Each structure stands twice: as C-alpha cells, then as structure tokens.
Nucleic acid binder design. Structure first.
Length: 545
DNA sequence: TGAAAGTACTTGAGCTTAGACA
C-alpha cells in the first residue's frame, strides 16, 4: 500500500514521513505513475530520496538515466548499508566483480533492485548486448538523470534509454530549472514541481574589484567576517586556483585547490579532508558540483564571474544546507566578462564550425549576457533570480546589497562607469578592437547559408569557398557585370558574336576569382577589369585576351 | 635655465573547463 511504502521509508531508511511537499507530490505521482518527472531542488538528501524511495518498490530493477556523471562512488557508498539492494560499478577493477555482476544481471530476477550507470561507460561494448538482454529479460523500470549534464553536456544522447530504449517513466531531479533548460529537458529528453527557493540566508552581494583597491584584503575580511564555522572560492583557471590559494594562505585564510593537473588520488584528500575541517577553504573552477554537499558551508565566493545564471546558481547552491546565514559574494570586473565572452565566442565558434546552428548556440550567449545584466542591473538579487527563473519576485530584506543602502550601491554602480570611460599597445589595441566588435556581433552569430548554384551556373569553380562571404548570387552578379562589359566591347569593336562571349566571361570570372582571396578585393579586381575593357573600347582597338 | 646614460631594485599583472579508456 501507499501508506505501507511511506512507512517502509522509515523501515528502510528511517524517515517517518516526507520532509517537504516536494516529496509528497513527486514521489506520490511516481508511486502512481503518470509521466516524466522533472524536479528542481537543492542538491543533497532530498532529491536523492526522490528517486531512491521509488527504487524501493522498483518492480524488479530500476535503471537510472545517470546519477550525475561521477560521485556515483558516493551514492553506491550511501545505500549498501541502508537496507537496500544497490549496485553501480565503473572503476575498471569492476571486471573482478562487475563481470559476474553482469552475469548477475543476465541472471533473471536478481538480488539487485537498483543499478547505477551513466553515459560514461554504458555506451561501451560491455553493455550494448547487456542493455538489450536486460530490457528483454523481464522489464526495465524508471529512468532518473537527476542532474542537467544531459542537455548541459560535453556523448550525451537525450534519446538514450528513452528514444532508443524508452521502456518506463523518466525522473529528472536536477538543481537548475531555467525556462530554456526545462524546455530542453522536455524536448531533448523527450510530479513536476519546483520550489521557489528564496533562501534569504544566502546574502547575495556583488562587489566590484575595479572599485576595490585591495581585492585580496577585501576577500580576506569577507572570509574572516564569515567566522570560523568551511568555505568555497570560485575562479576560472587552475593557474588562478593556485594563485588565489597561495595568496589566501599567505593572507591567513587556510586555502587550498581542487584541480591543477593533479589527480583524483592527488586531490581525493584535498576534497574529503575539506568536509572534516582539516582543510578550511578550497578553491576550484567547476570541480565542485559534486563531492558530498556538506552542511556547514559558510560562504561561496566567485573571484571571477560564472558562465551563466544557471551556472552561478548551481555553484551557489553548494552552500546553505543549514540555517547558517551564508553570504555568497560575486566579484565582478569589466575586464573579466570581457574575457569570458571572448572565449564563450571562441567556444560557440568551434562548436558551430564542427556542427550546425542550434538553440544552444545562442542559449549560451544570452545566458552569459543575462549573467552580465544581473551583475549590472539595479535591484534585489533574489528578485533578479526569481525573474530569471520566472518565479514570484520576492521583496526580500537584509538579503542583498540593494536592500541595505539605497545610495551606496548606486554610488558604486555609478563609479563603475566612471572607473574607465570609452610594443605594449599592439595587444591592447587588438584586444579592445576584437572585444568591441564582439559587441557588434552580439548574440547568435550564425548566418552562413551558403546556397549552392541553382541549376545552370555559368561559373568555373562555382562551388568554391576559397573566398569567404562570396555567396553564389554575388558571383553570378559579378559575372553579369563582366558579360555586360564584354557585350559593350563587342558593340564598340565589331567582333564575331556573343556566343563565345559567354565562355569568355566565364573564363574571366574564374580567373579573377583565382587571383582574388576576399570578396572586396575580388570585386575590386572585377570592376578593374571592367574599367580596362571600357578603356580599350574607348581607344577603339578590339579587346584582345 | 638648459644639462645623461647605464644599471640595480620593486611589483604586479595575468589565464577555459568539468565527466565515462591502461
């Protein structure tokens, strides 16, 4: 019975009932069974039980879309001694045991009910017959992806055990539910309810390093103001990770680093011993979306801006898993966003180059621009967060810089504009020029649409891309000009006929295209040849080749 | 009232990036 499994939650895990109406709706719907489940809620125990609890009455075996991508070795070492039958396997040694567990999988009605797997392996040949055998054996229930690394991926399918093996309802217990992302997981992924998180205990404050005379001292006193409880500082490069760690340790704040070309083995410590207060502060770029979301996270600081509002919120959500007031701060500067966008552009570029035009191509751009506006707009931080999520705008108090002083933050914003108007000079000019013209490019660059010649192009080497932005229409218009010039010369010189003039103009256009490299120079040469033809006609002699 | 050229010091920038093969 439903009440019986609700009590079994206590009998298996220990919780008498559901913590929040989140579970009371979502898990109830999963027990009934309606459709795909999309839930956004702060990472931790809750969202994990939102799929683990249905996995108790899994009707045999429940196939996870993917418990995140890594961490797994933390959820498997979270239920093996929780009165449940759970397994995962992926650490290569797996074979030792995995191999026969794959036979324990081949084994019908196994002593296993849960199976952790994620795009990392799975696509491997050890599973291609295994997945078909498992789905054909008796059943294959549920499909939980929890996180967003599906659409938000580096071969993420979005049509994996669903478009390719859809056999049961799906579960999406992510932590980010931006309108574009939720629409993508409704479409690309083929009860749904999100809590307006509010979280007044997280004092979202933004300080501009362009105005701070001593950013290092400011960040130090920010950490010291947060007392001695474990905190997180976010930056964007491993070199930055090392630099901030060294500077903070020299400033006192016991700092550290997560990634640096080091290794799981060469960081497992830094990470774990960060939970147990052995390391007070540790810095990373994106390597802290996992690793046991602990309770006493006193602050989360961003030395450099994030990649988006979704990214910023998902970093800042690795905090406040208590009543601890955790003032999370964002350090901002015009030089920073400048750099981020330039690389978001280079990424979007390469991507489009080795792909086609997708909604994500402009989605990343407008997400970063939304982050820029949020760090540049004037108003409550919680209100901006709700607006970006489309939730009810909260009139928060004592939760953001806007509500503290109604003119100091305005003064800082005004001074930001007044901070900077408008062999060392060459790089400065190049950076300024490219950054400024990236603003002219704006969002969704795209627009390539090289239409092939329609039916009867009179152009030698017509389908050529040696000259960028020289679409076929421009080319045959230039050939049209060349043929007009040839016809004028024919009238002014009284030669045979225009029948050979067609091939003559095609030859001239091909020669000009070969001698040219860019569209403007190609046109310059084309009308230079036209002017030469006109001059020859004016003189009187026939235009010889 | 102009007025000199090389060298020993400091300092302060400044950098894409996260999963699953040995």
């Amino acid at each position: 019975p439903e009440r019986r499994v609700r009590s079994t939650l206590k009998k298996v895990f220990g919780f008498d009932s559901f913590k929040t109406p989140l579970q009371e709706s979502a898990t109830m719907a999963v027990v009934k069974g309606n459709k795909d489940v999309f839930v956004c809620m702060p990472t931790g125990a809750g969202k994990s039980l939102c799929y683990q609890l249905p996995a108790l009455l899994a009707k045999g075996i429940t196939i996870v879309v993917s418990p995140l991508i890594a961490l797994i070795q933390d959820q498997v070492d979270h239920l093996l001694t929780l009165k449940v039958r759970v397994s995962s396997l992926n650490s290569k040694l797996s074979a030792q045991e995995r191999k026969e567990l794959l036979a324990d999988l081949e084994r019908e009605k196994p002593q296993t009910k849960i199976l952790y797997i994620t795009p990392e392996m799975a696509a491997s040949s050890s599973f291609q017959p295994t997945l078909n055998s498992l789905v054909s054996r008796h059943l294959l229930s549920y499909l939980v992806v929890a996180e967003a690394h599906c659409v938000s991926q580096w071969y993420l399918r979005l049509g994996a055990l669903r478009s390719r093996l859809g056999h049961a309802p799906c579960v999406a217990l992510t932590a980010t539910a931006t309108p574009q992302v939720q629409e993508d997981v409704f479409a690309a992924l083929h009860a749904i309810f999100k809590t307006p998180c509010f979280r007044a205990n997280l004092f979202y404050d933004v300080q501009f390093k362009e105005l701070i005379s001593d950013p290092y001292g400011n960040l130090k006193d920010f950490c010291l103001k947060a007392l001695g409880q474990c905190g997180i500082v976010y930056c964007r490069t491993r070199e930055a990770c090392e630099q901030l760690a060294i500077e903070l340790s020299c400033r006192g704040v016991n700092a550290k680093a997560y990634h640096a070309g080091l290794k799981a083995s060469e960081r497992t410590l830094v990470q774990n011993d960060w939970m147990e207060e052995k390391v007070p502060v540790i810095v990373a770029t994106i390597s802290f979306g996992m690793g046991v979301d602990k309770a006493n996270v006193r602050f989360v600081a961003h030395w450099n801006i994030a990649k988006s509002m979704a990214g910023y919120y998902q970093e800042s959500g690795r905090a406040g898993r208590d009543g601890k007031p955790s003032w999370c701060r964002l350090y901002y500067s015009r030089n920073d966003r400048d750099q981020v966008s330039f690389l978001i552009r280079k990424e979007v570029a390469k991507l489009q180059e080795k792909r086609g035009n997708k909604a994500s191509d402009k989605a990343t751009i407008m997400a970063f621009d939304a982050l820029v506006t949020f760090c540049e707009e004037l108003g409550c931080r919680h209100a901006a967060i709700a607006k970006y999520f489309g939730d009810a705008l909260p009139a928060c108090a004592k939760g953001c810089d806007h509500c503290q002083n109604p003119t100091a933050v305005r003064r800082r914003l005004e001074a930001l504009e007044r901070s900077s108007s408008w062999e060392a000079h060459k790089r400065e000019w190049n950076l300024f020029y490219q950054k400024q013209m990236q603003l002219r490019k704006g969002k969704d660059p795209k627009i390539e649409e090289f239409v092939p010649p329609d039916e009867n192009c009179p152009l030698k080497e017509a389908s050529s891309r040696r000259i960028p932005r020289l679409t076929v229409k421009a080319r045959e218009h230039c050939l049209r000009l060349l043929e007009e010039a040839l016809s004028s010369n024919r009238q002014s010189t009284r030669t045979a006929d225009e029948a050979d003039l067609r091939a003559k103009a095609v030859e001239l256009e091909h020669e000009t295209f070969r001698n040219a490299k860019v569209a403007n120079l190609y046109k310059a040469s084309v009308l230079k040849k036209v002017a030469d033809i006109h001059r020859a006609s004016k003189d009187g002699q026939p235009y010889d080749m």
